[PDB]
Every structure is written in C-alpha cells, then in structure tokens.
Amino acid sequence: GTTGERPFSDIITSVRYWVIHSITIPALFIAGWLFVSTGLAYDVFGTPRPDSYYAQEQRSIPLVTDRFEAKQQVETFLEQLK
Amino acid sequence: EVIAQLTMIAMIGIAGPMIIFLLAVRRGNL
Amino acid sequence: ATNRDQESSGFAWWAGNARLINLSGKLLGAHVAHAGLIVFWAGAMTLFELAHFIPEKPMYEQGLILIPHIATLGWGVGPGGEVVDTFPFFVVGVVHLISSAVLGFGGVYHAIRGPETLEEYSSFFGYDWKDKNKMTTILGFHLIVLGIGALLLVAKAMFFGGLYDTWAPGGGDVRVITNPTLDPRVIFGYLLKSPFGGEGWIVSVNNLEDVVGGHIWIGLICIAGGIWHILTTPFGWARRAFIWSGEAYLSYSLGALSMMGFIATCFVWFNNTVYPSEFYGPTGPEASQAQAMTFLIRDQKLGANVGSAQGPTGLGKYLMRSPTGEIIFGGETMRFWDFRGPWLEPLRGPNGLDLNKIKNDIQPWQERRAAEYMTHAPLGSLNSVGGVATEINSVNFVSPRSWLATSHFVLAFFFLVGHLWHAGRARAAAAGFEKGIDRESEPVLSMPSLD
Amino acid sequence: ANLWERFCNWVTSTDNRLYVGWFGVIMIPTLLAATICFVIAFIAAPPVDIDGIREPVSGSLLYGNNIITGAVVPSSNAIGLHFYPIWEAASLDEWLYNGGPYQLIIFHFLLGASCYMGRQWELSYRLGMRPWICVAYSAPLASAFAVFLIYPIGQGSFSDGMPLGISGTFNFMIVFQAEHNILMHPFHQLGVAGVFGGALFCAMHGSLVTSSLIRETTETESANYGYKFGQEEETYNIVAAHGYFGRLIFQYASFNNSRSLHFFLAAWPVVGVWFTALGISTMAFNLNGFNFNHSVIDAKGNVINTWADIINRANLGMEVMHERNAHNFPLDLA
Amino acid sequence: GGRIPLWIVATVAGMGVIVIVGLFFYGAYAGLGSSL
Amino acid sequence: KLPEAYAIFDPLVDVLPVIPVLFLALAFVWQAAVGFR
Amino acid sequence: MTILFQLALAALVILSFVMVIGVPVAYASPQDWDRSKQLIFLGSGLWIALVLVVGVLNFFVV
Amino acid sequence: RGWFDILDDWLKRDRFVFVGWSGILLFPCAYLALGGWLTGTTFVTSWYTHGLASSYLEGCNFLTVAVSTPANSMGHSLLLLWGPEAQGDFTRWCQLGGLWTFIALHGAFGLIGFMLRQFEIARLVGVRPYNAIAFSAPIAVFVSVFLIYPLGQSSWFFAPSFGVAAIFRFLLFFQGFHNWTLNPFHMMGVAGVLGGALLCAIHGATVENTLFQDGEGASTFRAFNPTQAEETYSMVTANRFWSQIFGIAFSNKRWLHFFMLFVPVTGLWMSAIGVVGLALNLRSYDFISQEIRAAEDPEFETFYTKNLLLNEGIRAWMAPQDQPHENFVFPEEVLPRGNAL
Amino acid sequence: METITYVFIFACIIALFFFAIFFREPPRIT
Ligand code: CLA
Ligand code: CLA
Ligand code: CLA
Ligand SMILES: C=Cc1c(C)c2cc3nc(c4c5[nH]c(cc6nc(cc1[nH]2)C(C)=C6CC)c(C)c5C(=O)[C@@H]4C(=O)OC)[C@@H](CCC(=O)OC/C=C(\C)CCC[C@H](C)CCC[C@H](C)CCCC(C)C)[C@@H]3C
Ligand SMILES: CC1=C(/C=C/C(C)=C/C=C/C(C)=C/C=C/C=C(C)/C=C/C=C(C)/C=C/C2=C(C)CCCC2(C)C)C(C)(C)CCC1
Ligand SMILES: CC1=C(/C=C/C(C)=C/C=C/C(C)=C/C=C/C=C(C)/C=C/C=C(C)/C=C/C2=C(C)CCCC2(C)C)C(C)(C)CCC1
Ligand SMILES: CC1=C(/C=C/C(C)=C/C=C/C(C)=C/C=C/C=C(C)/C=C/C=C(C)/C=C/C2=C(C)CCCC2(C)C)C(C)(C)CCC1
Ligand SMILES: CC1=C(/C=C/C(C)=C/C=C/C(C)=C/C=C/C=C(C)/C=C/C=C(C)/C=C/C2=C(C)CCCC2(C)C)C(C)(C)CCC1
Ligand code: OEX
Ligand SMILES: [Cl-]
Ligand SMILES: [Cl-]
Ligand SMILES: [Fe+2]
C-alpha cells in the first residue's frame, strides 16, 4: 500500500522540485569544490599537501611513537618542515 | 583542443536523445 | 501496436528483440543496421588508430589492433614491417565508415518504414523459419558469398600485392604467393593434427603458401556447398535430428561463433605467421625464449661456455634436452621449446639448437630482436602498466596479443552460454513447455516413482 | 522393436534411478576413469617432478602426506602442453615420475563434467521442464575449465594448472596473486561479490521463508512436518515476509514476486562466478590486476606508498620464493 | 504533479553521472595519483 | 597522423569509435520514452 | 584548392548531421511521408555526391 | 496515555522508513560509521600512523583509499576525541587514527541496532525472528575480526583498516603470518560461504526451471500473484530431476529453506572462532610430523613445505613497510629469495 | 596407521553415499 508520503516519481517530475534543486545541488557541489580549492580541507583534516610529506632532504616518515606525547609529536614534525 | 573533443561529443551525444524528443512532439511512431 | 508491447507479442521489453521473430522485414532492418555498426567501428577505429599512430614506435607499443591486420595483407608496409605508406590505412578506414552510412540508411529504412513483414511483398525475400528448402537456400547464398570472400584473400596474395611474410628472408617483407599448397594431404593434414603441445592443430600453420592454399580449398568448398544447399533439401535423417525454428538456428550459430572465438583466441596467442610479431608484439612463448637467448648471448660474450654450464638443478643453465632430446633453451622456458620464429630458426640444426651456430653465427639483429621481444613480453596490468604484476609504474604497455586473446575468450565464453540458453529454449519451445509445466498434465505425475 | 531401439529407450528412460541419457553415455566412463585414477594416485602415487627440474613433490598419503597436504601433482613443466597418455611413456614408472595421472584425471574430468552439464539439459527435456539449470552449472564448470585447462594453455604448461590437493590449491592461489595481482582484478572482485552476495542471499531467503512458516505443527514436533511432499499449497506466507522485509529496509527494496525473487537468487552468484571464471581465463593471457605501484608521488618525486604498495611487497615475497630452484633468468615471464 | 517526463530526468541524470565518473577516470591519468 | 588535410578533424576523430556504444544507450532512452511497454 | 576541399568536407559533416537526426524523425512521423520524400532523396544525392567530390579533391591536397 | 506510550506510538508508525526504538540506536551509529568512512577515505591521511596516503585528496582511487588503523603506539586506546591523546583537537584526532575507532565503535553499536531492529519489526509484524538470528553470523564476524583480533594483538594497528586494498593486505598478512588457509575453522567458513552461494544459485535455478505455466506469455514473471495459495513451481518435478541427476534431492520445502539459513550462518561462525584463535597467534601453522621429516630429509617436499616458503617470503618482504613502527632493517643479503628472482 | 585411518573414513563416506541414494526414505506424495 501507501505509507502516505508523496510518491517520488511525482516529486522529481514536478517543476517546483527542480526550481528548488537546480540551485541547491550545484551550490553544494561548488561548496565542496571550494572546500578543496580553498585548501581548507587540508588544514581541517591535517592532510599533507604534496609539498609537506617530507622535509626537503629527509627520507624518513613522521611516524608517531608515543601514546600520550603523540599530539606533541605530530606538532613538532610539522615545525621541522619550515 | 580537448573542448573540440568535448564539443563534438557534446553534440554527437545529444543527437540521440533529441531524435526521441522530436518524434515525441510529433506524436511520432516510437 | 504492431507487436511492440508486451501484451501482444508475449515478450517484455528486456526481451523485446524476440518480438521480431516472425516479422521478417523489421528483423532484416535490425541485422543491416547492426551490420551498420560493425562496419562503422571498423572505420572509426582505424582512423582513430591512424590519428594516434607514430611510425617510429612499434605497432605493438601503441595499442593498435586493426592497422596490424591491414599490414599483414601487405599494405603500407615494407621490409622488416617498417611502415612506408600510411595512406592505405586511411583508405580502409574511410571506405568502411562511409559504407556504414549506406548500411545505416538501409537498416533504419527496413526497421521503421519498410514492410514489417516481407512474405506478401515478394515471394523471394520473404521467408518462413520452418521452410526447410528456403532456409538452406539462404544458407546456400551466404555460403557462396563466404566462398568468394576467401578467394579475395587468395586474390590479394597471388595477383594484387601479396601478404606480409614474417618468414621471408631479410627479416621479413611483403611477397607474392605463386605456389599455394593444394595437396590436400597438407591442407587437411592440419585439421587432423593434435591440438596439444608440439602439434597445435591448425594454429600451427607457419607459412603463407599453406595459408593461401587453404583459402583456395575453403573458397571452393563454400561455393560448392552454397550450390548444394540451394539445389537440395535436407534429407530424412537431418530433418529428424534438428529443431527447425528461428531460435534454434540462432542457437546453432552461437555455437559456431563460440567455437570460433576460442580458436581465434589461441591463434592470436600462439601463431606468429598470420599474426606477425613485427606487428602484434611477440607471443608469450616467444618472449620467454627471447630472454633465454638474451642471457645466453651476454654470458657467452663474457666467456661462458653455455653448452656445459650446469645450473642449480643439475639441468643446463642455458641449454638442455626436451623430453624427445632436442636441444632447447633451459630454465622455465623449457615448456616453450615448441616455439618457432624467424629470429631463432637460423640457429637450429637437426638436433635442435646447434652449439656451433650459437658460438659463431649469432648476428646482432638476432640480439636486438631477442632483447626487444623479451622486454615486450605480453604481460601487463589492466590499466596498461607493462611488465610483471610487481613492476613499478613507468612503461605504458599491454600486448595486442593480450587484448585480442582476452577479449575474444570472454566473447566466446558468453556465446557458448548463449548457445545453451537458446538451444535449450528452442527445444522446450518446439516441444511446448517453455513457459512452464502444465498443471493439468504434469508429466512426472504419470511416471512411476523411482523407489 | 529392434535391438537398437530397445537400447535407445533404456538410455533415455526417465524410469532409471539415475538418469543415463546420451551425455550420460560419455559422462559415466570418463568420470569413473577420473575417479578411480585420482583415488589411487592420491593414496599411493610416488613423487612427481612438477616443475621439470628433477625436484619431485610428494603428493600421496603413503609418501608422507595427510589429507590436508596431499595432492595429485600437476605434470612436468618439461612436458608443457604436450599430450602425455600412458601409451606415450616408456613405462608406468616414467609416467608417474612425470605426472601423468594429472593429465588423465583432468581430461577425463573436464570431459565428464561437461557431459554432466549436458545431462542436466537432457533430463530437463525428458521431464517437460524449462532447460536453464544447466546454464547455472556453467559457472562452476567454467571455473574448473579455467584452473585446469585455460590457465595452463595461456601459460604454456599443465605444470601451472591447479593441483588436485587441499594445500596444492593454496599454492596455486598464492603464486597466482604474485604473478597476476588477482586481488586487484575487478573480475575477481566480482567473484567475491558473487559468493559473499550468494551466501548473504542464501541466508536471507532461508531466514525469511523460515520466518514465515505457517503454524501447522506443535512446539514438540519439528516445524518441518508442517510441509507434506507434493502438497498443493504453500507452507509460508510470502506476503508476511515481504511485510517484514519491506519494513526492515523499505517497501520496494523487497520482493513480492516469488519468480522475480528466485530468478535473482539464480542470477547473482552465477553472474559473479562467471566473471571470476573469466578473470582466471583472461589473466591466463597475462591481462593482470590493476597496478598502482608508486602511483602517488609528492611534489619532489618521493614515492608516497599507499595500501597498493604494501600489497606489492607481499606479492614480491611470493614472487621471489616460489619455485625457488626453477628460474635462471631475472623475469618470470610465464 | 508530473510536469517533467520521467525519461527526460533519467537521461539528464545519467549524462550527469557519466560526466562525473568520466572526470574521475580522467583524474587517474592527470595530476595526483597518475604515477607521473 | 591523418593526412594534414584532415588534421582539423582530429578531435572528431578521437570521439568517433565510441559512437556505437551510444546506440545501446539510445535504445534505453527510447524504451524509457515508451515506458518499457 | 585547399580551401574548396575543406568546404566540401564540412558540407559532408553538416548534412550527415542533418541527415542523422532528420531521416529517423522523417520516417516515424506519419504526416510528411510525402512532404519529406523529397527532402531525404535530395539530401541523399547530396550526401553521395559530396563523398565523391571530397574523394576527388583529396587527390589534389592529401 | 502515559508519555512513554505516546512516544512508542510515534516511533512504531507505519512510515516509508520505519524507526522504532531500535532506530534511536541504529540510525545515529550507522550514519556516523558510514559518514566517517566517506569522510576519512575522501579527506584523511594515514601518514603519521602508517607512512601511507589513503584519501582521494592525496590522490588515491577507490581501490586504495582507506580509513587506516591508528598507530601501534596507541595500544588499544579508545582514542576518544576528548581523551588524553588528542585532547579535543579534531585535526589531531584524524591524524592519530581516531576515525578508525570512531567507525569501529559506532559501526558495532549500529550492528546491534540493526539486529534489534530485526527483532522489533518481526515482533510487531508477527513473524518468527530467524532473520535476526541469521544476522548473528555477520556480527560474530565483525566482532571477531575488528575487535577481538586486535585486542589480542599488540594494538589496533593490526586490525583491518577500512579500505578495499587495505583488506587485501590483511588477507595476505594472514596468509604469511598466520597461515590462515590451513586453519580448519576458515576451511569450514569457506565451505559455508561457497556452499551458501551454491544453495543460492541451485535453488533459484531450480524454481525458475520447474515453474508451472500459470500465464500465457514468454515472460513468466507475470504469472505470479503473491496472494495465491498455490506453489508457483513443482516440488515433485524438482525432486525427481535432482534425485535422477544427483542421486538425492530435497523433498521438504521447510528443511530446504532452513538449510539455506544454516549453511552460510554456520560457516561464518566457524570462521570467527578461528580468528579468535589468531587474536592469540594460536594458529594452525605447521604440521609437526612434516617438519620433523623435512628437517631430516632434504628430498621430502610437499605442497605444505612449498607454501611455508612462500609465507616466509611474504613476512620478510612485506614487514619493514607494513609495520613501520618496528624499524626493521633487512639488508639485501638476508632477504629470502630463490634463484634468479 | 594414519594412512589407514584417512582411507577408512573416506571409504565409510563412499558407503554412506550408496545407502543415502539407494536406501533413502522414498519421497511420496501425501
Ligand atoms: C555454414 C555452414 C553450413 C551449415 C550451417 C550447413 C548446414 C547443413 N548442412 Mg551443409 N554443407 C556446407 C556448409 C554448411 N551446411 C558446405 C560448405 C558443404 C560442402 C562441403 C556442405 C555439404 C552438405 C551435405 C553434403 C549435406 C549437408 C547437410 C546439411 C544439413 C545437416 C547438417 C548436419 O547434420 O550437420 C553435421 C551434423 C552431423 C550429425 C554430421 C555428423 C558427422 C560428425 C559428427 C561431424 C564432423 C563431420 C566433418 C565433415 C568432419 C570433421 C572435421 C574435423 C577434422 C575437425 C544442414 C542444413 C546435409 C543435408 O541434409 O544436405 C541436403 C547433407 O547431406 N551439407
Ligand atoms: C543493435 C541494436 C538493436 C537493433 C538494431 C534493434 C532493432 C529493433 N528493435 Mg530492439 N532493443 C535493443 C537493441 C536493438 N534493437 C536493446 C538493447 C533493447 C533493450 C532496451 C531493445 C528493445 C526492444 C523492444 C522493447 C522492441 C524493439 C524493437 C525493435 C524493432 C523496431 C524498433 C522501433 O519501432 O523503433 C522505434 C523507435 C524510433 C522510431 C526512435 C528512433 C529509432 C531510430 C532507429 C534511430 C536511428 C538513429 C541513427 C543515428 C540514424 C541516422 C543514420 C542515417 C543517416 C543513416 C527494430 C528492428 C521493437 C519491435 O520488435 O517491434 C515489433 C520493440 O517493440 N527492441
Ligand atoms: C542483405 C541485405 C538486404 C536485403 C536482403 C534487402 C532486401 C530488400 N530490400 Mg533493402 N536495403 C538494404 C539491404 C537489403 N535489402 C540496404 C543496405 C539498403 C540501403 C542502401 C536498402 C534499401 C532499401 C529500400 C529503400 C527499399 C528496399 C527494398 C527491399 C526489397 C526489394 C529489394 C530489391 O528489389 O532489390 C533488387 C536488387 C537489385 C536491383 C540488385 C542490385 C543491388 C546491389 C547493387 C547489388 C550489389 C551487391 C554487392 C556488390 C555485394 C556486396 C555488398 C556489401 C556487403 C559489400 C527486399 C525485401 C524495397 C522495399 O521494401 O519495397 C517496399 C525498398 O523500397 N531496401
Ligand atoms: C563483505 C560481505 C558482506 C557485506 C558487505 C554485507 C552487508 C550486509 N548484510 C546485511 C544483512 C545480512 N547479512 C546476512 C548474512 C550474511 N552477510 C554476509 C556478508 C556480507 N554482508 C554473509 C557472507 C552472510 C552469510 C551468513 C543476513 C542474514 C542479513 C540481513 O538480514 C541483512 C540485510 O538486510 O541484508 C540484505 C545488511 C545489513 C545492513 C546494516 O547493518 O545496515 C546498518 C549499517 C551499519 C550498522 C553500519 C555498519 C558499519 C560497518 C560494520 C563498518 C564500517 C564500514 C564502512 C562504512 C565501509 C567500509 C568499506 C571498506 C571495508 C571497503 C548489509 C547489506
Ligand atoms: C560518423 C559521423 C557522424 C555521425 C554520427 C552518428 C551516427 C551519431 C550518432 C549518435 C548517437 C547514436 C547518439 C546517441 C546518444 C545516446 C545517449 C547519450 C543516451 C544516453 C542514455 C542514458 C544516460 C540513459 C539513461 C537511463 C534511462 C533512460 C533509463 C534507465 C536508466 C538510465 C540511466 C540507463 C557525423 C554526423 C557527426 C558526421 C561526422 C562523422
Ligand atoms: C533500429 C534501431 C536502433 C539501431 C540503430 C542503428 C544500429 C543505427 C545504425 C546506423 C548507422 C550505421 C549509421 C551510419 C552513420 C554514418 C555516417 C553519418 C558517416 C558519415 C561519415 C563522414 C561524414 C565522413 C567524413 C570524414 C572523412 C571522409 C574523412 C575523415 C574525416 C571525416 C571522418 C569527417 C536502435 C537500437 C538505436 C533503437 C531501436 C531501433
Ligand atoms: C583456411 C586455412 C586452412 C584450411 C582450413 C580448412 C580446410 C578447414 C575446414 C574445416 C572443416 C572441414 C571443419 C568441419 C567442421 C565440423 C563441425 C564443426 C561439425 C559439427 C557437428 C555437429 C554440430 C553435430 C552435432 C550433432 C550430433 C553429433 C548428433 C545429432 C545432433 C547434432 C546434429 C546436433 C589451413 C588450416 C590449412 C591453413 C590456414 C588457413
Ligand atoms: C565523521 C564525523 C562526523 C560526521 C560526518 C558525516 C555525517 C559525514 C557525512 C558524509 C557523507 C554522507 C558523505 C557522502 C558522500 C558520498 C559519496 C562520495 C558518493 C559518491 C558516489 C559515487 C561516486 C558513485 C557513483 C556511481 C558509481 C561509482 C558506479 C555505479 C553508478 C554510480 C553513479 C552510482 C561528525 C560531524 C560527527 C564530526 C566527527 C567526525
Ligand atoms: O611453474 Mn608454476 O609458476 Ca607461472 O611463473 Mn614462471 O611459471 Mn613457474 O614461475 Mn612463476
Ligand atoms: Cl611454489
Ligand atoms: Cl628461467
Ligand atoms: Fe525459495
């Protein structure tokens, strides 16, 4: 039967539907685009940029080796990139 | 250059859906 | 609603081409239109390969499957397989692509505008699937058309240029064939060879004379079978053996196509005569033999006596005996001692590889070919990283022999499934229980229990 | 009638406890030769020089194996793809040394199982059934053809077919991952989705039909006696299992057509096992799993490993150890 | 309630994904992750 | 390379071989049009 | 005449494109089976001639 | 009407997506397990935990992205965002592996929620809860593989990371360190999954090829009304077919669908037990009798000894980079290798 | 003794096959 809601085939063929979402969808796409194009996603999540995996002449990985000094450990490897 | 690539395929690909669109206006024989 | 809905034809949309079984005219449209697409692709693809072709790279470094087919027929190519004129490729391409539009035109005509059914418009082009005489008549015409096709190939080899002969001396050249082989002891000897190692059935055909000869035979066989069938009707024994329906005929041809795809798969993988390695890259066996050659040459240059070098296992490190005693390359490549190619045969004597020829007569073109083929061995990843599975990214290569073999095994497998599907269904349909079991007559219910 | 007709009518009798049929005429002898040989070799066959390097692998129980380690060992690499019937050997001793039972077993077996497939069609015809069960069996059959026939062909040797053994199978899989990165191949990914999905849908359907058995028994007897063989009626409430399952997810992710539901059960595992049989068949021609080794590099050019590089380190460990005495030259090109 | 035919939204949607995925397969050969 | 005469058609030539796959897709556009009757 | 060869060759493409869309619509529209009989017949001769015309011009520029 | 009963009314309403009391556990935890997987595979690295890229941002594709396990140096920390390690710093929590525990633990409570939901819906609809019972096997698998196994090991590092190729690595780790293929509990699991798929295919194919003719078209899907009394296919003809093809057949439709539940559910449970074993390195790695012979008889070779040699290759070639926190340094000369390769 | 044990269990299973097929409970239609 029908739980009672408006059928989907009915909403997405409606114009009012596409009036609303011809804006919001592309907008969300652009928001997410910008999230990465602003470089903002890098600093939120702490993800290295292609130039920040290593120091210029270092060949070893900033692996974390302490449970409680770990936050401090990551912060000090970041200082050693400048 | 690659817009040439995309513009040709843009038009080639829409040619199909369009035929169906035309024959539907004309109450054509789909 | 001329068929075209599920209510009238009995078939849903996902099986809608079954709506055409007894609509000879629309069905004619679909075949030609589809023939349209095949010739289209032959055309578009060739021009795409031409637009992407650099004559300085081997054909096989460039991802080409069709131009190598054109080069094998002796167009646009010189000694060693060097590309000397690209214009013939362009012609093959344009003509097919052009042709596809007339094909295109004709199929879309018949599928839409033309008569849905033909049998009242002309007694000759109309047909009924159950008309045993009319069916062998169509079969007969197409046999003759195929017979002609095979003779076009003879015609190109004997009168219109020749074929590329990888075995022609001076590293291979285009060559006219003048003594095709007609001895049926050879031509049909091939069909009687084992398909197993060292024999290879018809995949072993290693010279153009045998190829051209075999197409004379098959061309005349086909033409003579066309006539036979146009004039005859199936005899009692054949009538009682088969299902006479449109679906059954389809299932018999899916059967044939499957068989053929599988033979093609092995042809392109093992055969380096009508798939010259100049164009297609080396075979799997050829590459592996080429590596043994490469390191024989290098070590011997350093001072190694390669005939007396005992490797770790006790077997020769470079040379050993096949199980029938032939001298063959050692190491894992022992499995590939059946390989034959123009770069390697100069070193062969009556007992296999000849050590005096190894120590004295290896030319630098053989070192080059052997090094080239060992580093273009048909190994590569789906995304076209070349080499073994553990190779690093760098080389963008997958052998045309891999592409053509994998693709055609896949296609042959699914056409075997198509056979069983439509063969099974043809039998049920003919017997009348393809839509299921009759409740009022369920056959098992009249049968005695098994126990 | 005449003698030949009596025989034909017996061969095709739908009254024999086991259906024979024309396919059965070939199947029975070939499976029997394959089964007798295999059973005897598994127990008593002497060591087999699989890799052609005069380094024989013991596969049989009497030569120090157990059920898990035992195998009928693939024939010699020296043989490659040559046919090696018993009559081609100078002696049984030679034939055993070189792995002849393997060839005899798998040829008779492929042949016997192909006719088994045909036999499935044949009896469905004599019984008035629809015919496509045999199509379902084609997925398992094709899988067998791949490890026993196609993969040897592309690689040039039955020495690289799958061994007839529990640990031999594992050997085959490991060497396959290192030589083809089969885990990174989509057709094998499709095989896993095939068999996980098949197992999932098996458990779902069984659980869903079982959930909706109609009370026809008491709490002391087996629910199973609520169903009598050949009973006209259904013994579960599909409406009720749709109602349960449509609510578990939502109404239309659930089936209410028994036929569509059952065709989905057939098709999911068959398709995916087709793809993974096709995966072994195309890697047989060295079209291998995706390679992303050193696919990420940084602004200077350092390799930034990903999980694909870690898989490669494992792969490489298999590569360099497998058949440790069999390679003289730096690439394992088959 | 049904002013835009469904097949139309279908084709549009499809060409929508076809594009986005095409982009991702393109990205496998360009910039980050291309081995280059 | 094509003959330089047809160089200007290189981008249309790059796309031509995928055209036959659109025919398959065009069939589904068509049956959605007739509503999979 | 490098200029008259590219002329004709687009005449083929623009005409192909027209005929590719137009011929199927024409066919399954019942009204102008006669209004359009002429169109496609003429486009067709136009198409064919143009192939030939491009086909000969190639041999003055290719 | 008490307020509890009013809330029960709303939660158990017939809507397009049923909520229930179970939903209060189910939907938040599932959305965040999901969402955290999507977030981590899209944007988060494994650089400080593993020396690895693991997100689309870094240029990984769908096969190579992962939410990777936290560093071995974390032990078995819950890795709470407000906990001693990350101290409420969301950026640092991503970099130290918090999302892994975040996914692992919400995912676990989500599975609970899902099973409770199966119970809740069965009870209101009036059906037996064999489906919830069936879902016990995925739960045993998840719990055994993602929780028990690392809790037995040195840390969460060695649990599976959440990625396509990460899981492939885990398979291969398990071959080369645990010799998992040789473990009868996995072998029972293999049998139950491949046997489940067999039952799945053979039962669907049998139904579709013993249908009664209940309509008149060639699309046989339309000849079924879910309210019909009648069996849509013939148990009788199915039984004869399989008795004659295979020797034996099902005759009882109830046992048949019960057996379909049992086989794969029982196999996943056996596999789980074996992984509990491996939590402790309690492996079926060796056959002692083979090793005593092998060590004394250099001509004795079996597929068992050949596979251990492979295992040794995997361990040594893959460990330095797979367990970077160990600072394994293996000079070329110690790396086991056959000839030439 | 281990070889004999594996062969004995295997032989029992092959006998089981026999009885399971030929001495099954006959299915009947009630
Ligand atoms: C497209 C190709 C094709 C097809 C589909 C057919 C189809 C048919 N032919 Mg025709 N035929 C063809 C080409 C073809 N023919 C050609 C080219 C010739 C000339 C050589 C003939 C000569 C010919 C004759 C003389 C006869 C047929 C007959 C028939 C009918 C029965 C076929 C039959 O029993 O198959 C084969 C099925 C069998 C059961 C045959 C059993 C023999 C074994 C099992 C098969 C192998 C035989 C093969 C010759 C040797 C194998 C080679 C090996 C080394 C690989 C059927 C309509 C018969 C008929 O009714 O004619 C009017 C008949 O008598 N055909
Ligand atoms: C090679 C592919 C192929 C071909 C050739 C056909 C051909 C045919 N189909 Mg099948 N079909 C296919 C794939 C194919 N189909 C697939 C993949 C599906 C599954 C979705 C179906 C599902 C299906 C159903 C459900 C039915 C058919 C039917 C038909 C027939 C009549 C179609 C009709 O009325 O069109 C009407 C459509 C139109 C008028 C719209 C436009 C169509 C034209 C052909 C487009 C041409 C485009 C092209 C670019 C033209 C320019 C080239 C020119 C310059 C040369 C026709 C013979 C029908 C049938 O059997 O009739 C009884 C039918 O009912 N088919
Ligand atoms: C196998 C393909 C095939 C078949 C069997 C038919 C059969 C038929 N068509 Mg179709 N048709 C086809 C392809 C096909 N056509 C193609 C490709 C086109 C587009 C070019 C057309 C366009 C078309 C139209 C527009 C009409 C028909 C009509 C007819 C009917 C009359 C045929 C006639 O009088 O020809 C008589 C035969 C000749 C005059 C012989 C000359 C034909 C050529 C030049 C022979 C050359 C053969 C060639 C060299 C071999 C190689 C071909 C290629 C593969 C390389 C008949 C049912 C008519 C119809 O249905 O009436 C209502 C109709 O009006 N057809
Ligand atoms: C890899 C294989 C596999 C997967 C992916 C899977 C998945 C599923 N099975 C379900 C059900 C079932 N599975 C069953 C038996 C089985 N299921 C099996 C194997 C699988 N089952 C097998 C082999 C069996 C045989 C016994 C039964 C009997 C059922 C059901 O009744 C039920 C159903 O309706 O399915 C049709 C669904 C539970 C829905 C749910 O919990 O939503 C809620 C989602 C939650 C709580 C989030 C979980 C978070 C997970 C655990 C961790 C994070 C995962 C990341 C988001 C993604 C990581 C991806 C990388 C690993 C690549 C879900 C579709
Ligand atoms: C050669 C040439 C040419 C021609 C071309 C052609 C011939 C074209 C065609 C084209 C085509 C042929 C097109 C088509 C298209 C198609 C499309 C693009 C489609 C898509 C699809 C989709 C997307 C769908 C969707 C859906 C539906 C509807 C339903 C279900 C779901 C889905 C999603 C599936 C020209 C002129 C240029 C000139 C030059 C050269
Ligand atoms: C029926 C039908 C169908 C089908 C269809 C078909 C299959 C089609 C075909 C068709 C075709 C088959 C077409 C053709 C086309 C062609 C064209 C249109 C061509 C043209 C060309 C050109 C124009 C060229 C030019 C050039 C040159 C010369 C040189 C270089 C450059 C270029 C390339 C530019 C479908 C399924 C869809 C649907 C339903 C119905
Ligand atoms: C070109 C060439 C050549 C030649 C070729 C030839 C000469 C071949 C032929 C071919 C042939 C000569 C084949 C035949 C075929 C056969 C078949 C394929 C058969 C089939 C059969 C069937 C199918 C049957 C069935 C049945 C039975 C048995 C019983 C009853 C039922 C039925 C009828 C179903 C060579 C190699 C020198 C070189 C290269 C190129
Ligand atoms: C974690 C976290 C959180 C949460 C989060 C979440 C909630 C998230 C969300 C997220 C999401 C929710 C996401 C989503 C996304 C999705 C995606 C990414 C999609 C994509 C897909 C695709 C790409 C697909 C496509 C395709 C394919 C591939 C094939 C087939 C076809 C199709 C078209 C389907 C919070 C806040 C608490 C904070 C803390 C942490
Ligand atoms: O044998 Mn069995 O495994 Ca196929 O790669 Mn080459 O060969 Mn041997 O090495 Mn790796
Ligand atoms: Cl090995
Ligand atoms: Cl080697
Ligand atoms: Fe069922």
Side-chain angles (χ1 to χ4, degrees), chain H residues 169-237:
Chain H
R169 163 269 175 191
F170 190 80
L171 278 31
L172 301 178
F173 185 94
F174 264 49
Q175 167 59 39
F177 283 89
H178 293 312
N179 211 2
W180 184 220
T181 42
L182 203 67
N183 193 292
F185 287 105
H186 186 243
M187 308 177 164
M188 287 187 288
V190 174
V193 161
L194 287 183
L198 189 171
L199 289 181
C200 195
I202 198 162
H203 171 61
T206 291
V207 172
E208 281 295 288
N209 287 283
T210 54
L211 307 185
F212 293 108
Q213 178 177 356
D214 284 332
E216 284 302 317
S219 153
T220 57
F221 294 104
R222 291 188 121 79
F224 177 80
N225 201 267
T227 36
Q228 68 189 78
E230 294 73 26
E231 53 174 352
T232 199
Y233 66 99
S234 172
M235 187 57 43
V236 166
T237 290

Side-chain angles (χ1 to χ4, degrees), chain C residues 186-188 190-191 202 205 210-211 214-215 217-218 221 241-242 259 267:
Chain C
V186 175
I187 295 292
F188 298 90
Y190 274 111
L191 280 32
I202 64 174
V205 63
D210 282 5
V211 176
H215 281 89
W217 270 94
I218 265 288
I221 281 151
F242 293 98
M259 181 166 163
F267 246 104

Side-chain angles (χ1 to χ4, degrees), chain A residues 45, chain E residues 13-14 16-18 20-21 24-25, chain H residues 31-42 56 62 81 90 93-94 99 102-103 106:
Chain A
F45 295 107
Chain E
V17 309
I18 295 145
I20 295 180
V21 162
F24 295 170
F25 284 111
Chain H
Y31 189 75
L32 303 195
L34 195 75
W37 187 67
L38 298 173
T39 298
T41 59
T42 296
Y56 298 127
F62 164 73
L81 173 51
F90 166 90
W93 180 69
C94 294
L99 285 193
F102 182 95
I103 289 157
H106 285 85

